[PDB]
């Protein structure tokens, strides 16, 4: 299934490089994950723990962090994210 | 366990 | 140009 | 199409998460970076310069250094080890 992401997503994939407007979500799940290594937004540490307030990837969760177990989350952040 | 391991659990 | 850029020019 | 990595290359794939033994070669070019990023195998400063002797990737390329713009030698050293 291709999926359409809105602006502000296809920003952050075009960030790194992405040229579609559509993708599968294991595309998606890709490129945002390139993202956030790129913007080194995970804990050096503890590197499930992300913290993305006042980053671009923040405005799109809507929550200064999160970790990478909270799969329910991710998944929903980027549903509300896509023009279905 | 890498933040890619972590990651490519969500597929 | 970062390194992700760089790459996803192969796809 | 899917494809099929040769041992060494699929040990790579591994140590980043990848849970399957075929992929499409979009998949095996996101494991790749994945790695490359993951062990910082590329200039911070000019980052399509990739180092990589007495890696594990340096052994799969049979390279000490590569530059990302390299196309034909990224495809040729995939292609050398997959299962065809």
Redo the contacts between chains.
């Keep these: 299934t291709l999926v359409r992401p809105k602006p502000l997503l296809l920003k952050l994939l075009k960030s790194?490089?992405?040229?579609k407007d559509t993708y599968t979500?294991?595309?998606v799940?890709?490129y945002l994950?390139?993202?956030?290594?790129?913007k080194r937004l995970?804990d050096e540490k503890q590197?499930?723990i992300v913290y993305c307030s006042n980053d671009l990837l923040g405005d799109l969760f809507g929550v200064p962090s999160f970790s990478?177990?909270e799969?329910r989350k991710?998944?929903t952040m980027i549903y509300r994210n896509l023009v279905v | 366990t890498s933040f890619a391991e972590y990651w490519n659990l969500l597929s």
Tied chains: 1, 4.
């Design positions: 790194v490089g992405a040229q979500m294991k595309e799940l890709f994950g390139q993202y956030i290594m790129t995970y590197q499930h990478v177990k799969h991710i998944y």
